[PDB]
Amino acid sequence: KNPKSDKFKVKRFHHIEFWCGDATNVARRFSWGLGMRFSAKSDLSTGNMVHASYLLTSGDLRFLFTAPYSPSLSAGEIKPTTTASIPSFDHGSCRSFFSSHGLGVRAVAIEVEDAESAFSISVANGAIPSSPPIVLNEAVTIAEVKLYGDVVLRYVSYKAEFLPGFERVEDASSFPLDYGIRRLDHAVGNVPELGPALTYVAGFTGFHQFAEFESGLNSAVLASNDEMVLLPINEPVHGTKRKSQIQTYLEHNEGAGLQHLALMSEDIFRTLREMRKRSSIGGFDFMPSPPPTYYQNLKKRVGDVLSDDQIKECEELGILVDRDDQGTLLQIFTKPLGDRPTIFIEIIQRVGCMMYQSGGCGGFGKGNFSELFKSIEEYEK
Amino acid sequence: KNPKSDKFKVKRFHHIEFWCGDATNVARRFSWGLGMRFSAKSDLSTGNMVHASYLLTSGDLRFLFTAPYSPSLSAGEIKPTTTASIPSFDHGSCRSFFSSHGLGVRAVAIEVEDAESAFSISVANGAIPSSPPIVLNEAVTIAEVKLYGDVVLRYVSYKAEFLPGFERVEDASSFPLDYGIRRLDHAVGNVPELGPALTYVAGFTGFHQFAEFESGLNSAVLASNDEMVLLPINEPVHGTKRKSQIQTYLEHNEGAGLQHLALMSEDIFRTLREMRKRSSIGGFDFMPSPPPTYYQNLKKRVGDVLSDDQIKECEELGILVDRDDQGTLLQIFTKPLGDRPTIFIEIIQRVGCMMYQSGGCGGFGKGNFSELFKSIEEYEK
Numbered sequence: 151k152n153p154k155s156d157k158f159k160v161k162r163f164h165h166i167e168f169w170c171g172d173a174t175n176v177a178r179r180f181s182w183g184l185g186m187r188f189s190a191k192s193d194l195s196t197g198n199m200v201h202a203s204y205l206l207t208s209g210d211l212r213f214l215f216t217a218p219y220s221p222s223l224s225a226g227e228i229k230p231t232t233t234a235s236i237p238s239f240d241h242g243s244c245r246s247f248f249s250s251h252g253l254g255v256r257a258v259a260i261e262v263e264d265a266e267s268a269f270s271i272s273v274a275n276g277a278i279p280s281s282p283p284i285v286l287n288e289a290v291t292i293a294e295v296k297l298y299g300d301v302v303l304r305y306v307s308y309k310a311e312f313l314p315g316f317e318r319v320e321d322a323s324s325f326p327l328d329y330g331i332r333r334l335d336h337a338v339g340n341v342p343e344l345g346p347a348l349t350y351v352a353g354f355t356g357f358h359q360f361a362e363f364e365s366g367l368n369s370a371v372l373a374s375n376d377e378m379v380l381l382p383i384n385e386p387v388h389g390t391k392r393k394s395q396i397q398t399y400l401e402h403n404e405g406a407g408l409q410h411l412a413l414m415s416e417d418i419f420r421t422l423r424e425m426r427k428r429s430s431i432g433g434f435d436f437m438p439s440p441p442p443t444y445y446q447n448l449k450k451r452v453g454d455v456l457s458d459d460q461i462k463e464c465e466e467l468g469i470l471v472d473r474d475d476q477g478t479l480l481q482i483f484t485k486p487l488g489d490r491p492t493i494f495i496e497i498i499q500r501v502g503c504m505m506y507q508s509g510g511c512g513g514f515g516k517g518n519f520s521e522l523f524k525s526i527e528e529y530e531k
Numbered sequence: 532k533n534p535k536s537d538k539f540k541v542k543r544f545h546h547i548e549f550w551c552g553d554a555t556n557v558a559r560r561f562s563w564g565l566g567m568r569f570s571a572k573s574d575l576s577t578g579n580m581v582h583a584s585y586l587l588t589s590g591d592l593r594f595l596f597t598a599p600y601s602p603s604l605s606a607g608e609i610k611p612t613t614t615a616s617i618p619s620f621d622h623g624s625c626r627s628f629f630s631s632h633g634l635g636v637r638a639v640a641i642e643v644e645d646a647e648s649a650f651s652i653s654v655a656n657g658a659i660p661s662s663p664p665i666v667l668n669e670a671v672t673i674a675e676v677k678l679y680g681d682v683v684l685r686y687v688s689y690k691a692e693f694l695p696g697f698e699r700v701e702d703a704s705s706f707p708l709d710y711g712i713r714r715l716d717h718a719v720g721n722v723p724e725l726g727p728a729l730t731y732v733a734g735f736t737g738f739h740q741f742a743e744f745e746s747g748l749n750s751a752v753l754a755s756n757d758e759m760v761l762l763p764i765n766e767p768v769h770g771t772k773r774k775s776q777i778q779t780y781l782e783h784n785e786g787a788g789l790q791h792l793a794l795m796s797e798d799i800f801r802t803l804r805e806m807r808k809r810s811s812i813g814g815f816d817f818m819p820s821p822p823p824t825y826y827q828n829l830k831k832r833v834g835d836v837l838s839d840d841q842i843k844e845c846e847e848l849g850i851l852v853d854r855d856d857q858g859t860l861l862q863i864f865t866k867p868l869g870d871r872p873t874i875f876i877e878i879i880q881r882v883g884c885m886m887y888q889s890g891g892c893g894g895f896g897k898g899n900f901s902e903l904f905k906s907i908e909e910y911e912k
């Protein structure tokens with residue numbers, strides 16, 4: 151059931167912005183580890199005396215890495231005279247974010263028809279304003295409201311390449327890496343209390359609950375009208391035997407924030423081959439693979455979707471598989487992206503639900519919690 | 532002339548410690564870019580609730596990357612009960628350093644015979660104390676005094692693998708990268724006033740001035756008894772036509788600090804081939820190469836040390852060449868290592884002065900300032 155209750159017209163995920171202490175080193179690590187090309191910049195070389203911002207792209211996926219310069223470089227500026235390319239940026243906010251949370255996502259940006267209207271309707275329906283709408287070079291409008299913790303939901307609308315004041319990256323500096331990643335599938339927040347978090351966000355967006363089909367969490371998924379913007383939210387379940395990874399997150403992050411980004415691949419096998427080749431030479435590590443009993447149970451569950459060879463290739467790469475009513479999900483999780491046990495990445499591919507592929511095809515893999523546990527216990531046997 | 536006036540027994544450079552906001556991403560970038568292996572760690576997985584510290588090694592070169600965790604993880608600890616592996620670490624100091632200076636060197640560590648004695652003699656002769664001597668697991672002693680800006684000189688002495696509380700890195704996580712870098716040759720500070728900086732450091736170390744043989748700087752080099760610990764210092768020269776790069780550093784760094792680290796290679800040609808292959812895929816960029824007139828002038832200057840083929844290979848890789856009374860220097864400089872135009876790396880190889888090779892063989896390349904300018908002007912012609 152999809153009531154299509156969006157309070158304003160939402161298109162797709164636009165970008166994800168990380169707040170960093172040094173954007174250069176994070177961006178270069180991410181570029182090599184995920185196979186994303188350097189595509190635009192806004193920094194001292196482009197006249198930005200306020201913040202260094204580097205944009206990485208893979209297909210439609212846009213990752214932005216931003217860090218502050220010394221405030222002394224821009225001490226004479228005022229907001230009307232700023233050289234910042236992101237007018238919502240604030241030195242104090244950024245340093246406070248990073249010192250509190252460490253490396254993580256500051257903004258989940260979605261493209262909308264009219265960012266000024268989206269902001270107004272949002273705050274009229276309970277959204278806490280973060281940065282008012284600002285028109286950039288009469289071409290692009292940006293606005294921000296609070297989403298959860300210190301994460302903002304950023305609205306971007308275009309009248310008619312990233313943002314004004316960003317420059318395309320020199321082709322010699324721009325190596326065309328590509329491991330198959332194509333777009334952001336979903337972005338997930340961890341909160342202490344799920345109910346109030348959902349009521350707030352669904353309240354100002356009109357996003358609806360996306361239907362699902364002991365592991366330390368309860369969760370729900372908010373979705374836009376065509377279910378292409380997907381925002382799951384987790385809360386911890388306390389008092390278990392094994393401590394909730396949601397609770398660990400909240401402790402090490404100093405509260406609510408973004409837990410994982412799920413990146414859709416056009417060929418998860420190639421993506422995982424390429425990423426795993428680089429794990430020990432500057433790229434990303436992956437969670438420990440399931441025991442072979444997990445793959446020795448996959449035939450009974452998805453043998454009508456994947457061949458035995460394609461199942462064996464899942465075993466080689468540690469890929470997980472889940473299935474809902476309409477489709478199948480291949481997924482795998484990285485280890486945390488930085489020093490703290492907080493944000494990580496999920497790589498996914500969805501099979502089925504053709505009409506274009508409909509959003510959320512195959513679900514989000516919550517069945518893989520019990521299947522992983524089951525396979526682990528029976529592998530011990 | 533070498534008076535051998537060291538006030539205590541100094542051995543060699545031991546390590547360089549960077550203070551970071553996220554040690555993981557910086558360390559992984561540096562590992563891939565410079566061909567350094569992950570060799571030890573101290574972090575949550577080793578029981579350190581205070582700071583994440585990752586050690587990279589190439590030959591004798593040791594780079595340490597440290598970042599703070601949330602103070603909340605260790606709020607119940609006191610110094611007698613700390614889980615930090617580096618007892619001089621302080622959350623507030625580290626966050627203040629990084630917010631002020633961005634990514635950079637906090638500690639230049641040298642190995643000494645007796646770190647307690649080195650500290651005492653140093654402060655008795657004018658050194659400003661930073662962290663008092665602390666004995667670690669009855670095995671290693673660490674002490675720190677101020678060097679310049681917020682950079683400390685760290686003394687380390689061993690009674691008899693990095694430091695207690697650090698664990699060797701898992702062989703699967705430890706890929707044996709190596710591009711030929713073997714040791715730290717020198718570490719250079721930028722200061723507003725050279726005279727007082729030299730008087731201070733030479734005052735408490737007994738280091739002597741190392742003899743040399745319009746570019747925006749004056750400099751001098753302090754050296755230990757066998758001239759294997761080398762600490763150059765630069766000051767800006769104001770009122771020029773082209774603004775001093777030393778002054779730019781001081782502005783963007785918010786004052787004095789470490790300008791460059793010079794890393795000796797056993798084969799600078801292989802090192803530069805390997806590093807340049809990775810510049811656009813997560814590694815380090817290099818300064819723009821000299822015009823071919825520079826190499827079309829090299830035969831007249833070093834044709835008795837390098838063959839025409841080895842000179843052509845310098846041209847391919849952008850290597851600079853200089854010569855003093857006793858030896859020859861091959862050198863090249865990276866672009867800044869992070870967001871700000873502050874710290875960079877120099878790769879060097881020294882030819883000559885065999886007795887072992889004596890320290891500083893070939894000098895530091897200050898002649899390459901005029902040779903670069905000359906070649907540039909005559910290339911225009």
Ligand SMILES: Cc1c(C(=O)C2=C(O)CCCC2=O)ccc2c1c(=O)n(C1CCCC1)c(=O)n2C
Pocket residue numbers: 336338369370371382383384395410412437483496514515516518519522
């Ligand atoms: C995060 C996640 C998802 C997921 O993506 C998801 C949403 O997208 C939306 C709803 C909630 C929800 O869980 C699915 C399966 C998972 C994990 C996951 O984190 N772990 C962690 C153990 C320690 C680190 C990995 C697992 O073992 N399994 C099997």
Ligand SMILES: Cc1c(C(=O)C2=C(O)CCCC2=O)ccc2c1c(=O)n(C1CCCC1)c(=O)n2C
Pocket residue numbers: 717719750751752763764765776791793818864877895896897899900903
């Ligand atoms: C830093 C350096 C050295 C050097 O290492 C040195 C000391 O070790 C000790 C004494 C002072 C001293 O200069 C030698 C030659 C150099 C440079 C250098 O920074 N540049 C910069 C232009 C813009 C970025 C590169 C150059 O062009 N040349 C030729």
Ligand SMILES: [Co+2]
Pocket residue numbers: 336338410412496514
């Ligand atoms: Co997910």
Ligand SMILES: [Co+2]
Pocket residue numbers: 717719791793877895
């Ligand atoms: Co040098």
